Structure 1
């Protein structure tokens, strides 16, 4: 219930994927993704992991930025928005 998980997938040594999973489907994804792209200056994607967790994919270790964005916009509590160190 409301568990939004941010998870780093390390690809090639230092080059990384910030995968944000479980974002609410009331305010649409595309706009949010675009905003993130503008802010992060890094590429973002929409991933459909076996139709259970819809993922906003981002490039690079900018989890802090994601957190900040959440605080600004939709992630109100910072309790059910969880961070993986990996």
Structure 2
């Protein structure tokens, strides 16, 4: 007589598939507003990237929340909840392939 038992298992490792995308400046800024919330505004992103897909990635992988909004001064932009400037910079570099030199980060 005998019995079956698990010998080992595979981890999370896999090969890379990233590639360089074309230059164009992006601005990631922090907001201060009368509702007391801190928000991250994303501006200048290439129109070939769907803003609704940016929302979907930042809600799925980063666990944030956000919307597309038209500001009186800053124009049509994505708002994300909190100070996510480094996180959104990393998304544009990692998932879109945009080179780091294109991304401006601004405080408040």
Q: TM-score range by the shorter chain?
A: 0.7 to 0.9
Aligned residues: CA RMSD: 2.7
SS at match of 1:37: helix
Structure with the larger strand share: 1
User: For residues 43-86 of structure 1, what are the alpha-carbon distances to aligned partners after superposition, in whole Å with 9 as ceiling and x for unaligned?
Assistant: 11101236984311100112111111111122522112100022
- Large movers: runs of 4+ above 3 Å: 11-15, 49-53
| TM-score for both structures, normalised by structure 2 | 0.65
* Structure 2 alignment gaps of length 5 or more: 1-22
Q: For the structure 1 residues 45 and 36, does the alpha-carbon distance in structure 2 shift closer, same or farther, using more than 3 Å as the test?
A: same
| TM-score for both structures, normalised by structure 1 | 0.79
* Structure 1 alignment gaps of length 5 or more: none
Structure with the larger helix share: 1
Aligned length: 86
